[PDB]
Amino acid sequence: CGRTSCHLPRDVLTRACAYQDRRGQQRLPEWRDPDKYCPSYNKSPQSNSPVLLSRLHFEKDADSSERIIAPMRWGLVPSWFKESDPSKLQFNTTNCRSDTVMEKRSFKVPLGKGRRCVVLADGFYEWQRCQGTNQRQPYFIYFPQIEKVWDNWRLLTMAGIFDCWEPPEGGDVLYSYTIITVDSCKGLSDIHHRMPAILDGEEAVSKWLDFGEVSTQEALKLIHPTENITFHAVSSVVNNSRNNTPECLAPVA
């Protein structure tokens, strides 16, 4: 999936990420790089989106079940990239197939470092290929839910991999990510043949995040098609990646 919505303001987003650590203590995730968060209904590759990652990535003695929320660049910039600017990458690496993550250097290495994140979104967009034409129908795809809807929205929690890159001649460390993909479930199969790897609930999210306690092999068992998802058709407003408006995700007939 190549487009998402993530529009909620920082404190609403944070509240939506309330969790318990391993010992059952109620917490809210702490932000890092919070100025990089720019809410939008229409996020494309190369923009920043908030992700969850284990606090053990930031402190050597942190409880690895504690969670940080940090905006990261969508489009993985591998640690070994040698040019001066991420724009000079030939491919964005916005998605990666679950069946290639242990085969490709760009994913396998960060996984070895425990660089597992949970990519947040209101939902994602996908375009349905229809038989006997070139026009594609956009859909907004999201978890089943409980103006009023944004009070207590359940954010979509997608499995991602992140990496850290430093400009070779000198500059700040860049955190960037890719979303893992899997086959679509029967519910989405008329829309598209692929879907994100969705981590459905606290257990799945915690295990994917906690690289301290959950090995790569164990973590990857969490990666599979899932059924707990819904969707509705949206207008052509979203088609233009420059349109950031509530209309992007509004239902149409």
d(CA 25, CA 18): 11
Q: What is the DSSP letter of 46?
A: T
Residue 190 burial class via C-beta count within 10 angstroms: exposed 0-12, middle 13-18, buried 19 and up? exposed
Domain count, the chain: 1
d(CA 234, CA 27): 35
Tokens of 242: 């420059």
Domain range for 216: 1-253
Contact call for residues 70 and 209 (beta carbons, < 8 A): no
Which residues are part of the catalytic machinery? 1, 126
Q: How far is CA 166 from CA 55, 56, 77, 114, 184, in A?
A: 21, 20, 10, 19, 35
Under 8 Å CB-to-CB from 225, ≥6 apart: which residues? 182, 183, 184, 185, 195
d(CA 6, CA 123): 8
Tell me how the structure was determined: X-ray
d(CA 235, CA 125): 11
Beta bridge partners of 142: 230
Tokens of 236: 């052509």
d(CA 207, CA 224): 14
CA dihedral 181, 56, 171, 34 (to 10 degrees): 80
d(CA 62, CA 141): 35
Q: Tell how far CA 137 is from the center of its chain.
A: 23
Q: From 125, 174, 115, 97, select the one nearest 6 (Cα to Cα).
A: 125
First-to-final CA distance of the chain: 23
Q: What burial letters (b/e) apply to 96-122, b meaning 16+ CB within 10 Å?
A: bebeebeeeebbeebbeebbbbbbbbb
Pairing of strands 40-43, 48-54: unpaired
H or E segment and range at residue 10: helix 10-15
H or E segment and range at residue 203: helix 202-209
Residue 39 burial class via C-beta count within 10 angstroms: exposed 0-12, middle 13-18, buried 19 and up? middle
d(CA 188, CA 158): 16
Pairing of strands 67-74, 30-31: parallel
Q: Tell how far CA 169 is from the center of its chain.
A: 30
Q: Where are the alpha helices (DSSP H) in 59-140?
A: 105-112
The CATH number linked to 132 is 3.90.1680.10
Return the residue matching tokens 């058709």.
233
